[PDB]
């Protein structure tokens, strides 16, 4: 007889949990029916976007397992993810290969 | 006819403007600029006069701050003339840009 | 008898170390330096293993970014050698002091 | 011996839809946990502020939307809003 608010909304992300985390968080007295559906969608979406590009970066290193370094290459190579995560360190993510031109040897 | 040497009025102006707090952009041009930009986001928009003045106060404080940082950049390069490369280096190190 | 020229090994290290993600400080020196600094705020302190590593991750990330902005301030003054004054200018514009 | 919740189960399900022959390290899964919790806090926070500014007791779909608009850059915001109205469409059309 029971059906998860997620399976209803079309989401792998827990509408139920999100709703509870919104209550136990002191964001507001009350929480509209859709807000947790919306919020869950947005988190899923943004997960897909990163896991997509992380996938693509893992594939270029001849790798099937996504590691921190793959997440970092996907995020800093994307103008919008890289801004959203402008003040975020990915542990074990290292940096993008970048040698200023004038530091290159002459011949 | 008696000229001040290059720099002497620039330093006179640094002393004068650093002493005062009046906005340095003309009110009306700045108000037009605000209206254009807002219009381009949403038509039929109106502004409390205080909103425009809050924007003007924020814009001038920003631009003055950026010129301090910019000037530090020229001097770091052993110049005393600010150039666009100075503003850009400043905004990169402020993390306002990649 | 064959010797690499100044700054050729440098580039190599650059390419090497920009490819890797391993922490680049030895764990124990750092563990000692944490407990020291921390002693001064509360004595008899214990540190989860993940606490210390969270700190080293953050600290090394910070310094590597500072070296990037430092390097841009060196390159801006038409050098290739980072100097205190580059570290100092990067911290000043970032808002870490002065 | 008490329950330590995460988003891993849900990160993994999205991974598979998007790259069905691709895995993901403990340490990477950590980073996706951090990520979700962070954007959760940013969006929930701006939504809270919005409701407070308009003297409202309730964070609805609308607050989440507006928060998403303020917090996500350009394209990310547009796609996030579509994915977000879609899921709320599907859920209002479920008996």
């Amino acid at each position: 007889k029971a059906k998860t608010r997620s399976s209803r909304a079309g989401l792998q992300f827990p509408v139920g949990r999100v709703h509870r985390l919104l209550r136990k968080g002191n964001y507001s007295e009350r929480v509209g029916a859709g807000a947790p559906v919306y919020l869950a969608a947005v988190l899923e979406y943004l997960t897909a976007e990163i896991l997509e590009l992380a996938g693509n970066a893992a594939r270029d290193n001849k790798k099937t397992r996504i590691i921190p370094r793959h997440l970092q290459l996907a995020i800093r190579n994307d103008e919008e993810l890289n801004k959203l995560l402008g003040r975020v360190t990915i542990a074990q993510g290292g940096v993008l290969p970048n040698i200023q031109a004038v530091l290159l040897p002459k011949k | 006819p008696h000229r001040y040497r290059p720099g002497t009025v620039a330093l006179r102006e640094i002393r004068r403007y650093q002493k005062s707090t009046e906005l340095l952009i003309r009110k009306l041009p700045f108000q037009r600029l605000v209206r254009e930009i807002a219009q381009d986001f949403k038509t039929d928009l109106r502004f409390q006069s205080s909103a425009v003045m809050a924007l003007q106060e924020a814009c001038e404080a920003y631009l003055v701050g950026l010129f301090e940082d910019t000037n530090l950049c020229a001097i770091h390069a052993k110049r005393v003339t600010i150039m666009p490369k100075d503003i850009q280096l400043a905004r990169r190190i402020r993390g306002e840009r990649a | 008898p064959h010797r690499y020229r100044p700054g050729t090994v440098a580039l190599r290290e650059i390419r090497r170390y920009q490819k890797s993600t391993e922490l680049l400080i030895r764990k124990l020196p750092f563990q000692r330096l944490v407990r020291e600094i921390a002693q001064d705020f509360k004595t008899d302190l214990r540190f989860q293993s993940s606490a210390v590593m969270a700190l080293q991750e953050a600290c090394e990330a910070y310094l590597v970014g500072l070296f990037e902005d430092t390097n841009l301030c060196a390159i801006h003054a038409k050098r290739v050698t980072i100097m205190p004054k580059d570290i100092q200018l990067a911290r000043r514009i970032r808002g870490e002091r002065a | 011996r008490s329950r330590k919740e995460s988003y891993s189960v849900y990160v993994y399900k999205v991974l598979k839809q998007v790259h069905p022959d691709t895995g993901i390290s403990s340490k990477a899964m950590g980073i996706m946990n951090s990520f979700v919790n962070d954007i959760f806090e940013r969006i929930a926070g701006e939504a809270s502020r919005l409701a407070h500014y308009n003297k409202r007791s309730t964070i609805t779909s609308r607050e989440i939307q507006t928060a998403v608009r303020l917090l996500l850059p350009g394209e990310l915001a547009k796609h996030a809003v579509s994915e977000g109205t879609k899921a709320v469409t599907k859920y209002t059309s479920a008996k």
């Binding site: 979406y45 103008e79 919008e80 801004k83 970048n98 031109a101 | - | 390159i75 | 999205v14 839809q17």
Partner: peptide, 17 residues
């Protein structure tokens, strides 16, 4: 997968490349 992903993704323009 079944997500409305971004069609094109641009790189950020770094100062100094």
């Amino acid at each position: 997968g079944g997500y409305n992903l971004r069609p094109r993704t641009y790189q950020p323009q770094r100062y100094g490349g």
